Design a protein around this ligand. Structure first.
Ligand SMILES: O=P(O)(O)OC[C@H]1O[C@](O)(CO)[C@@H](O)[C@@H]1O
Ligand SMILES: O=[P-]([O-])[O-]
Ligand SMILES: [Mg+2]
Ligand SMILES: [Mg+2]
Ligand SMILES: [Mg+2]
Ligand SMILES: [Mg+2]
Length: 328
């Protein structure tokens, strides 16, 4: 009878500081969309929600019916929250400017449904978000979303996995909240989560072996054939960034989506895929790099910009950074 809900938690975060409850309104609103997406996902084949919508998005994806439903849910709850002024979605070419009467201080970048290739085979999928404070007096505009991820004030993801989890990172740390399906509340289950300094799993799509740079190639060989006779790492690659990153957080190790000979900036999208996960990782004591610079320090010039990303346990990410340095 005294459960610790995400709302209560975020409210106390506010109690620790002072002023505005807009962040609590924002996150409460996003939680409502996450529950609606979870319920849809959990019955998607009955509801005939698998399959394509009818267009191609901004960064070349085939749009799925759950992309459209989840995007509409997230956009509508954030508008109604009175906490936001500019929205960037994977699914929309341009930033969305919130109408004057509903604007609040925050800028939200999100991927309303991530892990598209895994929808139809019932593998874990998720929602990713990052939240900035508007940094100016001028009329809110797309340029307000063009901040480096170091300026995030909150970020995280919803994982629609064997259970539904909301992982929320803010200035003082990372906390995990599980959706209780019976009462429709996210309940704190893991407090001040920290990643292991070194793990034993590496996560990458090795079907790109022919295109990898020499540093990634040498690192994967070292995971399979360690020069000190330690046990090889195990491999995992779910193929949904939210699921592979959440495993990396809770078990340690490393996740990689690097640059390659065909993709100089990788595949994943900086604003709403890479920066949120880099922020969660740094607040959990991990690292997130392109191989040459910190993801959170990149100043974007395009809301749909791509970036290479290597994240996870600090000793694992540092080992790969050393190999990039040695090759450089
Ligand atoms: O099939 P690939 O190229 O390994 O891409 C998988 C990546 O694509 C995404 O679905 C993004 O498009 C991520 O969730 C995942 O990490
Ligand atoms: O969010 P999508 O690129 O799987
Ligand atoms: Mg997509
Ligand atoms: Mg999309
Ligand atoms: Mg998506
Ligand atoms: Mg995506």
């Amino acid at each position: 009878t005294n459960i610790v809900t995400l709302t209560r938690f975020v409210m106390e975060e506010g109690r620790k500081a002072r002023g505005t409850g807009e962040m609590t309104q924002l996150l409460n609103s996003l939680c409502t969309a996450v529950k609606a997406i979870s319920t849809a996902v959990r019955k998607a084949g009955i509801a005939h929600l698998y399959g394509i919508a009818g267009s191609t998005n901004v960064t070349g994806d085939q749009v799925k019916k759950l992309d459209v439903l989840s995007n509409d849910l997230v956009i509508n709850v954030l508008k109604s929250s009175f906490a936001t002024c500019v929205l960037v979605s994977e699914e929309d070419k341009n930033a969305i400017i919130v109408e004057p009467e509903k604007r609040g201080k925050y800028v939200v970048c999100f991927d309303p449904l991530d892990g598209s290739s895994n929808i139809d085979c019932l593998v874990s999928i998720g929602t990713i978000f990052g939240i900035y404070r508007k940094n100016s007096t001028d009329e809110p505009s797309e340029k307000d979303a063009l901040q480096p991820g170091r300026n995030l004030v909150a970020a995280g993801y919803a994982l629609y996995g064997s259970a539904t989890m909301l992982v929320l990172a803010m200035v003082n740390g990372v906390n995990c909240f599980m959706l209780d399906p019976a009462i429709g509340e996210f309940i704190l289950v893991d407090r001040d989560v920290k990643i292991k300094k070194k793990g034993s799993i590496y996560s990458i799509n090795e079907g790109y072996a022919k295109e990898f740079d020499p540093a990634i190639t040498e690192y994967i060989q070292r995971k399979k054939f360690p020069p000190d006779n330690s046990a090889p790492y195990g491999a995992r690659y779910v193929g949904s960034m939210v699921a592979d990153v959440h495993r990396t957080l809770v078990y340690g190790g490393i996740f990689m989506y690097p640059a390659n000979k065909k993709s100089p900036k990788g595949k994943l999208r900086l604003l709403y895929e890479c920066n949120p996960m880099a922020y969660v990782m740094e607040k959990a004591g991990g690292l997130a790099t392109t191989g040459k610079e910190a993801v959170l320090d990149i100043v974007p010039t395009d809301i749909h910009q791509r970036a290479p990303i290597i994240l996870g346990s600090p000793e694992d990410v540092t080992e790969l950074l050393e190999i990039y340095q040695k090759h450089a």
